[PDB]
């Protein structure tokens, strides 16, 4: 049974139970979708190029450099 074509014209079930419209027209986005989608994109970009733009200043890297230049003073 590794050569016969499948007996399925389309994957069963509807994605989010939303019945596709007649062919040719769009999905008719809902009122909440557009602001929520643009805010999701803004969140993604802010957390992407904002988090990996903040200088690494903390109590960890400052202490790291300080102890790296202070453990070497054993004499």
């Amino acid at each position: 049974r590794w050569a016969t074509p499948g007996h399925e014209e389309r994957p069963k079930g509807y994605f989010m139970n939303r019945t596709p419209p007649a062919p040719g027209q769009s999905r008719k986005w809902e009122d909440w979708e557009l602001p929520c989608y643009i805010t999701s994109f803004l969140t993604i970009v802010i957390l992407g190029v904002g988090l990996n733009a903040k200088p690494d200043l903390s109590i960890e890297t400052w202490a790291h450099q300080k102890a790296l230049e202070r453990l070497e003073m054993e004499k």
Partner: protein
Amino acid sequence: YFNLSGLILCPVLGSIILLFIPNSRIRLIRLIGLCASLITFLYSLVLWIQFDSSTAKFQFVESLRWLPYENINFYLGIDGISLFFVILTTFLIPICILVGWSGMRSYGKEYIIAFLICEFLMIAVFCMLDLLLFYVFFESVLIPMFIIIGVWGSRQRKIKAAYQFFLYTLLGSLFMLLAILLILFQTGTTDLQILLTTEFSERRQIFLWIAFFASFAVKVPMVPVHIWLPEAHVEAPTAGSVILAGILLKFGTYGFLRFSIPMFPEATLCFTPFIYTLSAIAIIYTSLTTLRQIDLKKIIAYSSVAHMNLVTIGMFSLNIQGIGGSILLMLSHGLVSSALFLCVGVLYDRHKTRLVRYYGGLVSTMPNFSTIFFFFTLANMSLPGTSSFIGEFLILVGAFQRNSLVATLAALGMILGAAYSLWLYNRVVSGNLKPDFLHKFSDLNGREVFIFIPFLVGLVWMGVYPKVFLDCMHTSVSNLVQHGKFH
């Protein structure tokens, strides 16, 4: 110059615009409310960009006079701890708007008024350094939650549910107010920076610590007083009930961090075993009570009670890692419990039973809901790889380093967490399908599918890489642990 003033003004403008909008224009009310909430969320996120996690002192502060002699005044600001709570508060509310989006016609515009009012109200709580006004906004959240529970409650028995949630809060609130009066009359002001630098009397320390504990033991469910949360929490709308365990439950627990631990260094040490002997038996008793439960909402609330009693152990165990783990666990719980109540409320909005007996075999249908529910149960199941486990592992580490006995009882909590949550999952969405009761039912559409996406991504992000959350607040936790003593 994205300061804290705008973060509080924006929800106020959103509420004010909504007040003068006709009820007929239901299209505009929801759109503008959601837009205001999302703008507030982005304005909170941008603060994380300019946080400057280096200084021990406080971040952006706004000072507004409140008394003729500038004795006490509105003094804003975050240090390292309330920042994440502000972000999560600004993030949960748009989810509240989205979950109650379809049925807004019956709710009206008054539904969004209460939510936005509580929104900037809880925003003004976390970033409020002045001690007294912290109490003013700490109990200001009574009215919005009272209204949400009562006006849009599910069943008719909501009348008795709200009374407990109110009066239990008022008792502790006024008990704290007396301590605030004693502190102000003794010291002279209530500004946090000064009041942390005042030599107190040991006999006075114990009484004031008890007075603060009078209310802070009600917000976090303790053994003597935890009846209000289940009764007044099963009987609230899903959009509203998702922040009783979301932000309304983190006031007292976080209030311990800001107004109890550095405030009374010599009293928390003397009262440490009492908190241990309360929370350790709470995590056992509440967890056992959870097993013999039938309502779908109450089990999640009891699991939340157990999680808060667990985080209380790790908070009073003064460790640089204990407090950080407490904050991580509180954020993770705010995510997972919110997700779980949405998951158990989407079932109610379709069938309206709230009984595990009727539910069964929900894997043969609505599989996406089953997958989401399984993921959030695993998150509540305390598995490594999710943000929770990072949460309670540090709690256990901090407790064991101080006391060996308390750690074993606390870990009994995560042992017993597999007895009720997994049983609920296998008894709701993995049983034998029964067509007698659930004749017909749909699956999640595009709204609730997108609702869980931020929850899932934040859960995984803070579970596999919690570095940024710990990176942003190592200075503040270090300053909080080292206080009063000099060794």
